[PDB]
């Protein structure tokens, strides 16, 4: 080092950039940290080595500070704090925009060992910069996609540290200026106040608003189970019901109408109320199709991996468009209308059971089931279909010299064996009778073993059970709804819903920061 | 009256236990189920009747029966070009079949899990 | 003991970015460990063995 120093060279050897795709522009300094050498690193710094860099890896560490954090060494971070003399301002961000905190969260893993140490260092760095900056916003710096590190937690599907960052204890010395998102008062056992800040559910896109839609997720079903959330949620629900059940009721009415309009519709009160029927249908139809439409718009045509949660949305849409289409071809007097109509009907009712989402708690199992069961059943249905088709052509071919002939027909005579109205009759008529019957018998056996396979399969699937995970699945299933009924109808029955949701004013003038605005929890 | 009798099983036998625990959860879940089953079958009922509205497959109740017998498996599924929208009619009740199936499956597993 | 090599190495990582020696596992030369386990191997349960990391990385690749 003293040699390169003595060289007086334009760029010392620390200015060297490691090659792309593995560690891109990674300093020997970064390498040093990677090697966990405190002394020589302190020297490199003392050699006048620099912070700001790009290391790429899968540990981004564009601020070497962050690299240190990733390595989980205090001494070195404090060494940055001190060494050489200056520190690396945490206020500095990388090319991804991701600040050290954001970085921590990125790398924040499930593994509760690693997760724990990360927590320790997280809060530690929090109080550190808070003791050193000391006053500036350490959190709240927008990432690439603008994100608080907490917001970043959500989108990245972070979990344990989300729990931590949410429920914190800092307090002394000034650490209560950070506030740790907590307070307590007027209780024998902890009657506590919570700071709903980025969670506020109206302002911009809340933590809730993130997790709800924007968030990709292996499993989001867990996160809404967090206390400072579900208290709020349930509250909002209690708050929100009557409008919900009303909307429900409206829908129901509409169905009634639709039904009558269909049933009492002749082969063409009185013609007056007939035209009324059709028109009313058309009105409902346009309404919904509008509603659901701008719903998608509001999703910006967001790629729906939410299908599992969102299928109802689609069903509405599809229903609606079929309805209005039906009436189109009514006025136009097209041949096929009532088939499309009644399809929209049948579907319509089938759509209804959506509003179970709210009422009952076994809806939970109905849904978890709905998820896995539909997946497995599809996989199944394809194969069933295919080989039955095989057998179809078999039978038809052997029959090709009364009439058991039509392929479709043959396939029916063969399908009715799975709902058990089937035949299996033997007749020497066919003259290869032997093999024909032998064959469909093979069919029977085969489709049986198939259904058995499926039955057990999905059975096993729920045998291994995360239990209240389902409960939570229901919980959020409800949450999405609440966040949607949060704002009005841009079908414009009521276009503008107020931002009237809000939080209690904060009681906290700790030190130089003089106030907040927040929420209340209880007991435990 | 007879159905009432089996009350006095309460005393005699010890598998009465499982018969009851079952009786509890099973009845709850079965009710929840039965409502939905009922409702959408009703939907399909009006569908079929409507398409049939131009021998007689007509009476709503009747139609609902012809459709119910698919769940105890005496049902029909016969195709006839008679109706002239035959295509869709049969297509529809086929949807029915599939649907009520996936439903019973759902229930079966559900309560199964409950006692798992 | 690194002449025996222990079938391992490591470099250029904050956490262990490692190199493996595929020797008798090489999947082409003669009959590989894979080629053995695949067919020749009698087994109560072979289903476990392919789950080993230095394998399934190779396999998936």
XYZ file of C-alpha atoms in Angstrom:
701
model
C 0.000 0.000 0.000
C 2.806 2.377 0.990
C 4.461 1.471 -2.312
C 1.480 2.384 -4.511
C 1.140 5.488 -2.322
C 4.791 6.350 -3.011
C 4.198 5.843 -6.740
C 1.974 8.949 -6.675
C -0.021 7.217 -9.436
C -3.094 8.926 -11.125
C -5.341 6.024 -10.117
C -4.226 3.755 -7.240
C -5.081 0.052 -7.439
C -8.335 0.544 -5.410
C -9.817 2.496 -8.345
C -9.761 -0.850 -10.224
C -13.161 -2.085 -11.499
C -14.095 -5.830 -11.343
C -15.565 -7.157 -14.599
C -19.297 -7.308 -15.446
C -21.976 -9.974 -14.849
C -20.371 -11.471 -11.657
C -19.164 -8.489 -9.708
C -19.164 -5.425 -12.027
C -16.742 -2.647 -10.953
C -16.321 -4.379 -7.582
C -13.433 -2.758 -5.698
C -10.608 -4.631 -4.036
C -12.023 -2.688 -1.098
C -15.307 -4.524 -1.562
C -13.256 -7.685 -1.812
C -11.639 -6.780 1.515
C -14.981 -6.384 3.190
C -15.959 -9.689 1.605
C -12.880 -11.183 3.228
C -13.932 -9.606 6.533
C -10.541 -7.888 7.146
C -11.093 -4.935 9.483
C -7.527 -3.659 9.744
C -6.440 -3.562 6.100
C -9.825 -2.123 5.192
C -9.237 0.614 7.767
C -5.914 1.064 6.020
C -7.455 1.217 2.535
C -9.645 3.934 3.867
C -6.506 5.395 5.455
C -4.979 4.904 2.017
C -7.777 7.204 0.857
C -10.052 4.566 -0.728
C -13.617 5.783 -1.549
C -17.182 4.755 -0.699
C -19.399 5.486 -3.719
C -19.286 2.528 -6.180
C -21.103 -0.134 -8.221
C -20.336 -3.769 -7.263
C -22.485 -5.446 -9.967
C -23.141 -10.926 -6.904
C -26.728 -10.936 -5.519
C -25.565 -8.676 -2.648
C -25.702 -5.272 -4.209
C -23.680 -3.245 -1.735
C -23.275 -0.242 -4.068
C -22.615 1.617 -0.822
C -19.766 -0.375 0.757
C -21.450 0.503 4.059
C -24.329 -1.628 2.920
C -21.876 -4.351 1.996
C -20.607 -4.260 5.568
C -24.160 -4.503 6.784
C -24.664 -7.505 4.559
C -21.619 -9.017 6.249
C -23.135 -8.137 9.638
C -20.102 -6.417 11.260
C -20.698 -3.397 13.562
C -17.034 -2.525 14.115
C -16.564 -1.784 10.444
C -19.678 0.325 10.123
C -18.640 2.332 13.115
C -15.245 2.424 11.382
C -16.900 4.049 8.405
C -18.629 6.346 10.833
C -15.198 7.278 12.158
C -12.832 6.146 9.457
C -11.069 7.730 7.906
C -12.606 10.720 9.557
C -15.794 11.067 7.500
C -18.641 8.601 7.295
C -20.664 7.398 4.353
C -23.872 9.489 4.496
C -26.776 7.051 4.635
C -28.670 9.771 2.759
C -26.671 8.603 -0.270
C -28.477 6.154 -2.588
C -27.300 3.790 -5.372
C -28.129 3.513 -9.121
C -31.179 1.411 -8.215
C -31.964 4.339 -5.933
C -32.128 1.728 -3.161
C -30.779 3.189 0.079
C -28.899 0.970 2.527
C -32.101 0.267 4.375
C -33.845 -0.681 1.147
C -30.907 -2.931 0.519
C -31.195 -4.638 3.893
C -34.809 -5.296 3.191
C -33.978 -6.628 -0.254
C -31.648 -9.182 1.152
C -33.893 -9.722 4.122
C -34.712 -13.424 3.922
C -37.144 -15.861 5.543
C -34.333 -17.496 7.576
C -35.106 -16.165 11.087
C -31.452 -16.463 12.164
C -30.278 -14.218 9.302
C -33.514 -12.265 9.616
C -32.849 -11.658 13.308
C -29.325 -10.368 12.858
C -30.619 -8.201 10.054
C -33.217 -6.785 12.441
C -30.557 -6.071 15.047
C -28.336 -4.262 12.557
C -31.325 -2.549 10.995
C -32.546 -0.889 14.159
C -28.934 -0.385 15.181
C -28.148 1.531 11.995
C -31.418 3.375 12.420
C -30.428 4.677 15.861
C -26.886 5.123 14.600
C -27.702 7.540 11.780
C -30.370 8.997 14.043
C -27.611 9.692 16.589
C -25.259 10.997 13.930
C -27.215 12.791 11.120
C -28.909 13.098 13.631
C -31.988 14.889 12.221
C -33.077 14.157 8.612
C -35.504 11.540 7.125
C -33.544 8.277 7.270
C -36.629 6.431 6.015
C -39.001 7.595 3.298
C -36.551 7.862 0.453
C -38.169 6.564 -2.770
C -36.545 3.484 -4.361
C -36.324 2.848 -8.119
C -40.070 2.502 -8.136
C -40.660 5.078 -5.419
C -40.827 3.157 -2.152
C -40.315 3.566 1.529
C -38.124 0.702 2.692
C -41.261 -0.600 4.337
C -43.196 -0.262 1.095
C -40.227 -1.999 -0.495
C -40.717 -4.741 2.073
C -44.218 -5.234 0.913
C -43.577 -5.365 -2.830
C -40.583 -7.618 -2.300
C -42.800 -9.829 -0.136
C -40.650 -9.329 2.978
C -42.114 -10.824 6.176
C -40.356 -11.067 9.529
C -38.700 -7.714 9.325
C -42.044 -6.337 8.210
C -43.374 -7.550 11.550
C -40.384 -5.907 13.269
C -40.442 -2.572 11.402
C -44.100 -2.409 12.061
C -44.135 -3.145 15.798
C -40.989 -1.443 17.245
C -39.564 -0.247 20.555
C -36.917 2.486 20.555
C -37.827 5.234 23.053
C -34.602 6.496 24.817
C -32.443 8.499 24.302
C -33.987 10.359 21.346
C -34.982 7.040 19.712
C -38.559 7.987 20.558
C -38.145 10.752 17.908
C -37.996 7.805 15.485
C -40.973 6.737 17.603
C -40.587 3.046 16.787
C -44.252 3.231 15.578
C -45.454 2.748 19.149
C -46.658 4.315 22.314
C -48.509 3.207 25.465
C -50.759 4.749 28.154
C -53.690 4.320 30.574
C -53.513 0.567 31.039
C -52.488 -2.018 33.652
C -51.313 -4.032 30.624
C -50.175 -1.901 27.640
C -53.153 0.039 26.136
C -51.193 1.248 23.107
C -51.323 3.821 20.290
C -50.096 3.066 16.717
C -48.739 5.422 14.094
C -50.539 4.810 10.824
C -48.315 6.824 8.461
C -47.582 5.031 5.211
C -50.297 2.539 6.283
C -52.994 5.277 6.310
C -55.067 3.522 3.652
C -55.993 6.766 1.774
C -52.956 8.975 1.262
C -51.292 8.037 -2.069
C -50.661 4.276 -2.162
C -50.697 2.853 1.375
C -48.828 -0.200 2.606
C -52.257 -1.822 2.405
C -52.773 -0.477 -1.108
C -49.396 -1.961 -2.034
C -49.802 -5.406 -0.580
C -53.289 -5.619 -1.988
C -52.514 -5.338 -5.661
C -49.062 -4.138 -6.725
C -47.360 -6.752 -4.535
C -46.069 -9.882 -6.199
C -46.061 -12.632 -3.651
C -45.253 -16.251 -2.880
C -47.652 -15.857 0.009
C -49.304 -12.563 0.883
C -51.911 -14.425 2.930
C -49.673 -14.062 5.938
C -49.050 -10.362 5.945
C -52.557 -9.032 6.494
C -52.668 -11.214 9.637
C -50.360 -8.677 11.320
C -52.058 -7.045 14.276
C -51.715 -3.299 13.536
C -53.353 -4.145 10.231
C -56.238 -6.458 11.026
C -57.359 -4.253 13.871
C -57.618 -1.428 11.355
C -59.133 -3.717 8.763
C -61.841 -5.160 10.960
C -62.606 -1.656 12.100
C -62.939 -0.464 8.508
C -65.177 -3.413 7.864
C -67.526 -2.745 10.781
C -67.501 0.750 9.430
C -68.245 -0.421 5.848
C -70.947 -3.136 6.009
C -74.292 -1.476 5.343
C -73.158 -0.195 1.965
C -71.890 -3.706 1.185
C -75.031 -5.557 2.062
C -76.995 -2.881 0.208
C -74.972 -3.395 -2.943
C -75.550 -7.077 -2.550
C -79.261 -6.580 -2.259
C -79.333 -4.471 -5.383
C -77.549 -7.178 -7.274
C -79.990 -9.742 -6.042
C -82.930 -7.662 -7.150
C -81.365 -7.343 -10.523
C -81.140 -11.092 -10.824
C -84.757 -11.537 -9.896
C -85.647 -9.193 -12.683
C -83.371 -10.891 -15.142
C -84.928 -14.223 -14.298
C -88.509 -13.091 -14.685
C -87.643 -11.301 -17.930
C -86.391 -14.623 -19.179
C -89.054 -17.010 -17.864
C -92.167 -14.947 -18.682
C -90.576 -14.093 -22.024
C -92.738 -15.827 -24.636
C -91.738 -17.385 -28.004
C -91.682 -13.807 -29.424
C -97.524 -5.925 -17.051
C -98.026 -6.727 -20.770
C -95.870 -5.703 -23.729
C -95.211 -2.455 -21.826
C -93.593 -4.121 -18.825
C -91.959 -6.501 -21.318
C -90.107 -3.654 -23.003
C -89.475 -2.421 -19.440
C -87.894 -5.736 -18.650
C -85.546 -5.693 -21.593
C -84.615 -2.079 -21.045
C -83.973 -2.569 -17.356
C -81.705 -5.454 -18.261
C -79.880 -3.219 -20.682
C -79.420 -0.606 -17.976
C -78.024 -3.084 -15.454
C -75.824 -4.505 -18.172
C -74.319 -1.203 -19.218
C -73.857 -0.237 -15.605
C -71.857 -3.292 -14.665
C -69.850 -3.463 -17.828
C -68.858 0.124 -17.243
C -68.025 -0.557 -13.598
C -65.874 -3.588 -14.104
C -64.390 -1.942 -17.161
C -62.912 1.094 -15.436
C -62.027 -1.328 -12.654
C -59.561 -2.913 -15.055
C -58.562 0.601 -16.175
C -57.793 1.413 -12.595
C -55.637 -1.673 -12.712
C -53.942 -0.036 -15.698
C -54.479 -3.461 -17.203
C -52.158 -4.729 -14.454
C -51.074 -8.305 -15.253
C -53.507 -10.287 -13.063
C -51.746 -13.102 -11.273
C -54.551 -12.231 -8.879
C -56.805 -14.582 -10.871
C -56.989 -16.772 -7.808
C -58.471 -13.838 -5.882
C -59.956 -11.934 -8.820
C -61.999 -14.478 -10.790
C -65.242 -12.909 -9.692
C -64.252 -9.598 -11.324
C -63.867 -11.398 -14.615
C -67.086 -13.289 -14.229
C -68.918 -10.053 -13.695
C -67.382 -8.527 -16.752
C -68.135 -11.472 -18.954
C -71.665 -11.722 -17.673
C -72.313 -8.070 -18.263
C -71.053 -8.012 -21.800
C -73.148 -11.063 -22.568
C -76.205 -9.416 -21.180
C -75.977 -6.262 -23.251
C -74.968 -8.283 -26.241
C -78.121 -10.328 -25.759
C -80.309 -7.279 -25.881
C -78.379 -5.974 -28.845
C -79.313 -9.034 -30.797
C -82.868 -8.659 -29.314
C -83.398 -5.259 -30.926
C -81.476 -6.328 -34.018
C -83.657 -9.447 -33.771
C -80.771 -11.860 -34.426
C -81.457 -15.624 -34.551
C -79.530 -16.736 -31.490
C -80.221 -14.388 -28.620
C -81.963 -16.270 -25.826
C -79.164 -18.821 -25.697
C -76.673 -16.031 -24.993
C -79.199 -14.475 -22.691
C -79.798 -17.489 -20.529
C -76.124 -18.182 -20.515
C -75.741 -14.782 -18.977
C -78.501 -15.730 -16.607
C -77.107 -19.047 -15.366
C -73.680 -17.449 -15.104
C -75.262 -14.507 -13.394
C -76.551 -16.509 -10.536
C -73.394 -18.555 -10.394
C -71.644 -15.176 -10.076
C -73.771 -14.237 -7.059
C -72.089 -16.400 -4.501
C -69.307 -13.808 -4.512
C -71.205 -12.017 -1.803
C -70.626 -14.978 0.474
C -67.184 -13.390 0.880
C -68.522 -11.314 3.730
C -71.209 -13.216 5.497
C -69.817 -16.522 6.694
C -66.622 -17.858 8.068
C -66.672 -21.308 6.413
C -66.379 -19.252 3.213
C -62.687 -19.596 4.138
C -62.530 -23.332 3.507
C -64.850 -22.945 0.524
C -62.238 -20.651 -1.026
C -58.985 -22.446 -0.058
C -60.697 -25.454 -1.516
C -61.810 -23.398 -4.536
C -58.104 -22.582 -5.193
C -56.384 -25.909 -4.957
C -59.351 -27.901 -6.099
C -59.770 -25.942 -9.268
C -56.120 -26.240 -10.128
C -56.035 -29.995 -9.629
C -59.376 -30.469 -11.305
C -58.212 -28.717 -14.455
C -55.043 -30.784 -14.678
C -57.284 -33.791 -14.288
C -59.946 -32.789 -16.746
C -57.573 -32.499 -19.604
C -56.324 -36.052 -19.323
C -59.736 -37.455 -18.763
C -60.917 -35.723 -21.834
C -58.048 -36.875 -23.982
C -58.140 -40.535 -23.437
C -61.905 -40.665 -23.474
C -61.519 -39.136 -26.887
C -59.200 -41.989 -27.779
C -61.796 -44.525 -26.748
C -64.361 -42.565 -28.669
C -62.649 -43.044 -31.962
C -62.066 -46.637 -31.040
C -65.701 -47.424 -30.529
C -66.849 -45.436 -33.480
C -64.390 -47.174 -35.699
C -65.490 -50.628 -34.630
C -69.076 -49.596 -34.975
C -68.393 -48.225 -38.473
C -69.547 -51.539 -39.901
C -79.022 -49.663 -34.407
C -76.729 -46.697 -35.165
C -74.141 -46.174 -32.384
C -72.284 -44.114 -34.978
C -71.986 -40.373 -34.403
C -68.625 -39.571 -32.780
C -70.146 -37.013 -30.420
C -72.924 -39.467 -29.650
C -70.426 -42.244 -29.051
C -68.558 -39.997 -26.700
C -71.749 -39.373 -24.808
C -72.669 -42.997 -24.472
C -69.183 -43.260 -23.083
C -69.392 -40.181 -20.842
C -72.557 -41.284 -19.077
C -70.374 -43.897 -17.354
C -68.809 -41.298 -15.212
C -72.115 -39.985 -13.813
C -73.208 -43.547 -13.753
C -76.090 -43.549 -16.104
C -73.960 -45.557 -18.478
C -74.646 -48.719 -20.409
C -72.101 -51.553 -20.725
C -74.707 -53.718 -22.487
C -73.295 -56.611 -24.539
C -74.835 -57.609 -27.878
C -73.500 -60.048 -30.485
C -74.924 -57.632 -33.085
C -71.553 -55.931 -33.673
C -69.743 -59.208 -34.405
C -66.606 -57.929 -32.762
C -68.829 -57.552 -29.719
C -66.195 -59.308 -27.673
C -63.601 -56.639 -28.070
C -65.941 -53.724 -28.110
C -67.373 -54.415 -24.725
C -63.947 -55.488 -23.512
C -62.707 -52.146 -24.524
C -65.269 -49.949 -22.855
C -64.791 -52.063 -19.784
C -61.170 -51.029 -19.869
C -62.481 -47.554 -20.091
C -64.504 -47.908 -16.942
C -61.646 -49.339 -14.968
C -59.373 -46.652 -16.211
C -61.483 -43.604 -15.557
C -62.134 -45.035 -12.129
C -58.505 -45.334 -11.195
C -58.142 -41.856 -12.508
C -60.789 -40.277 -10.293
C -59.382 -42.182 -7.402
C -55.930 -40.796 -8.116
C -57.324 -37.245 -8.181
C -59.418 -37.629 -5.109
C -56.544 -38.809 -2.983
C -54.220 -36.280 -4.570
C -56.083 -33.171 -3.503
C -56.999 -34.930 -0.296
C -53.254 -35.151 0.503
C -52.849 -31.529 -0.506
C -55.170 -30.459 2.312
C -53.935 -33.203 4.652
C -50.772 -31.128 4.805
C -52.518 -27.998 6.075
C -51.358 -24.581 7.246
C -54.793 -24.278 8.899
C -55.313 -20.611 9.978
C -53.335 -19.716 6.829
C -56.703 -20.371 5.250
C -58.264 -18.110 7.846
C -55.909 -15.406 6.718
C -56.598 -16.200 3.079
C -60.170 -15.319 3.874
C -59.060 -12.260 5.805
C -57.332 -10.674 2.860
C -59.940 -11.921 0.496
C -62.070 -9.554 2.522
C -59.431 -6.867 2.594
C -59.313 -6.444 -1.146
C -63.024 -5.862 -1.075
C -62.772 -3.238 1.577
C -60.088 -1.336 -0.294
C -62.236 -1.397 -3.343
C -65.394 -0.174 -1.649
C -63.067 2.443 -0.169
C -63.775 4.580 -3.205
C -67.275 5.113 -4.586
C -68.349 4.070 -8.071
C -66.533 5.534 -11.131
C -69.503 3.906 -12.774
C -70.474 7.255 -11.246
C -73.554 6.307 -9.287
C -71.369 8.187 -6.836
C -68.177 9.015 -8.768
C -66.225 10.750 -5.991
C -65.889 9.036 -2.656
C -64.386 11.272 0.012
C -60.898 10.784 1.435
C -62.833 11.062 4.741
C -60.901 8.228 6.315
C -58.218 9.520 8.626
C -56.328 9.019 11.897
C -56.377 10.663 15.364
C -54.000 13.601 15.838
C -50.745 12.642 17.546
C -49.970 13.611 21.136
C -46.174 13.444 20.723
C -43.914 16.587 20.723
C -40.698 14.686 21.611
C -37.631 16.964 21.372
C -37.256 19.100 18.251
C -39.899 17.102 16.326
C -43.161 18.564 17.758
C -46.121 16.265 16.600
C -47.639 13.282 14.684
C -51.089 12.027 13.482
C -52.003 8.436 14.331
C -54.200 5.473 15.414
C -55.238 3.533 18.556
C -54.962 -0.198 19.526
C -55.633 -1.919 22.884
C -54.811 -4.231 25.796
C -52.897 -7.520 25.378
C -90.944 -40.407 14.990
C -88.666 -43.209 14.100
C -85.978 -40.824 12.984
C -86.341 -39.338 16.481
C -85.715 -42.727 18.103
C -82.013 -42.924 17.561
C -81.712 -40.455 20.434
C -81.570 -43.426 22.738
C -78.294 -44.426 21.142
C -76.897 -41.715 23.429
C -76.485 -44.285 26.158
C -75.776 -47.617 24.627
C -72.693 -47.364 22.452
C -69.414 -45.594 22.475
C -69.081 -44.931 18.722
C -72.156 -42.751 19.317
C -69.387 -40.251 20.143
C -68.077 -40.017 16.594
C -71.625 -40.222 15.251
C -72.391 -37.047 17.206
C -69.170 -35.030 16.667
C -69.773 -35.820 13.044
C -73.461 -34.899 13.420
C -72.343 -31.424 14.644
C -69.770 -30.358 12.128
C -71.264 -32.292 9.282
C -74.649 -30.723 9.659
C -73.205 -27.251 9.794
C -71.114 -27.709 6.669
C -73.874 -29.548 4.880
C -76.315 -26.701 5.404
C -73.871 -24.102 4.123
C -73.422 -26.366 1.142
C -77.050 -27.109 0.493
C -77.985 -23.527 0.081
C -75.527 -22.890 -2.715
C -76.296 -26.109 -4.439
C -79.912 -25.239 -4.382
C -79.424 -21.744 -5.690
C -77.432 -22.365 -8.751
C -79.392 -25.455 -9.653
C -82.333 -23.116 -9.595
C -80.467 -20.892 -12.021
C -79.957 -23.776 -14.396
C -83.577 -24.679 -13.954
C -84.829 -21.449 -15.364
C -82.242 -21.724 -18.073
C -83.441 -25.059 -19.312
C -87.067 -24.210 -18.973
C -86.584 -21.050 -20.916
C -84.845 -22.787 -23.786
C -87.449 -25.480 -23.742
C -90.225 -22.856 -23.797
C -90.372 -23.222 -27.566
C -92.265 -33.995 -25.617
C -92.932 -31.484 -22.810
C -89.797 -30.884 -20.685
C -91.612 -27.759 -19.519
C -92.720 -27.588 -15.892
C -90.136 -25.679 -13.830
C -90.387 -28.094 -10.906
C -90.200 -30.979 -13.353
C -87.201 -29.440 -15.070
C -85.529 -29.076 -11.731
C -86.135 -32.729 -11.065
C -84.749 -33.916 -14.346
C -81.791 -31.839 -13.300
C -81.669 -33.075 -9.693
C -81.573 -36.747 -10.613
C -78.004 -36.091 -11.792
C -76.804 -35.834 -8.288
C -78.135 -39.264 -7.231
C -77.066 -40.431 -10.605
C -80.283 -41.481 -12.151
C -79.963 -38.521 -14.464
C -80.293 -38.212 -18.204
C -77.905 -36.122 -20.333
C -79.575 -37.420 -23.512
C -79.009 -35.294 -26.631
C -81.777 -34.748 -29.189
C -81.854 -32.340 -32.145
C -85.567 -31.889 -31.337
C -84.975 -28.671 -29.367
C -83.072 -26.985 -32.211
C -80.806 -25.241 -29.760
C -79.956 -28.760 -28.649
C -76.302 -27.858 -28.842
C -76.419 -25.320 -26.093
C -78.994 -27.035 -23.994
C -77.002 -30.165 -23.532
C -73.834 -28.096 -23.293
C -75.411 -26.284 -20.471
C -76.550 -29.189 -18.365
C -73.136 -30.663 -18.904
C -71.748 -27.564 -17.274
C -74.162 -28.291 -14.538
C -72.802 -31.753 -13.993
C -69.227 -30.606 -13.882
C -70.133 -27.854 -11.524
C -72.144 -29.760 -8.978
C -69.376 -32.320 -8.996
C -66.651 -29.875 -8.138
C -68.968 -28.608 -5.499
C -69.480 -31.932 -3.738
C -65.801 -32.528 -3.974
C -65.113 -29.188 -2.319
C -67.493 -30.066 0.530
C -66.213 -33.546 1.003
C -62.632 -32.453 1.404
C -63.686 -29.476 3.492
C -65.298 -31.408 6.311
C -62.682 -34.086 5.856
C -60.027 -31.465 6.750
C -62.171 -30.324 9.653
C -61.846 -33.752 11.270
C -58.273 -34.233 10.028
C -5.629 -32.306 2.103
C -6.567 -29.886 -0.664
C -4.615 -32.251 -2.993
C -7.462 -34.670 -2.208
C -9.479 -31.515 -2.893
C -12.482 -32.659 -0.867
C -14.516 -32.078 -4.098
C -14.816 -28.389 -3.248
C -13.512 -24.925 -3.714
C -14.756 -21.360 -3.148
C -14.122 -17.850 -4.546
C -15.527 -14.406 -5.435
C -18.431 -14.319 -3.003
C -19.480 -12.623 0.249
C -21.141 -15.982 1.003
C -19.398 -19.012 -0.587
C -19.682 -18.885 -4.434
C -18.273 -22.383 -4.933
C -16.801 -24.663 -7.614
C -17.508 -28.448 -7.754
C -15.391 -31.238 -9.167
C -17.517 -33.382 -11.443
C -15.168 -36.354 -11.934
C -16.923 -39.697 -11.715
C -20.192 -37.688 -11.831
C -19.355 -36.269 -15.303
C -22.443 -37.825 -16.884
C -20.647 -38.864 -20.142
C -17.328 -40.539 -19.406
C -17.905 -44.317 -19.027
C -20.687 -44.932 -16.492
C -21.152 -41.859 -14.283
C -22.428 -41.803 -10.719
C -25.617 -40.550 -12.356
C -25.503 -43.359 -14.910
C -25.129 -45.799 -12.017
C -27.884 -44.551 -9.780
C -30.191 -44.250 -12.741
C -30.305 -47.852 -13.831
C -27.712 -50.274 -12.452
C -28.513 -49.260 -8.865
C -30.749 -51.530 -6.848
C -32.489 -49.447 -4.258
C -34.884 -49.363 -1.328
C -35.234 -45.685 -2.106
C -33.216 -43.945 -4.799
C -35.706 -41.072 -4.796
C -33.605 -39.376 -2.171
C -30.228 -39.404 -3.801
C -30.873 -37.249 -6.853
C -32.084 -34.545 -4.434
C -28.428 -33.916 -3.517
C -27.374 -30.411 -4.461
C -24.261 -30.976 -6.624
C -26.503 -33.239 -8.664
C -29.768 -31.387 -9.119
C -27.961 -28.203 -10.016
C -26.286 -30.143 -12.813
C -29.505 -31.922 -13.664
C -31.675 -28.842 -13.912
C -28.957 -27.252 -15.974
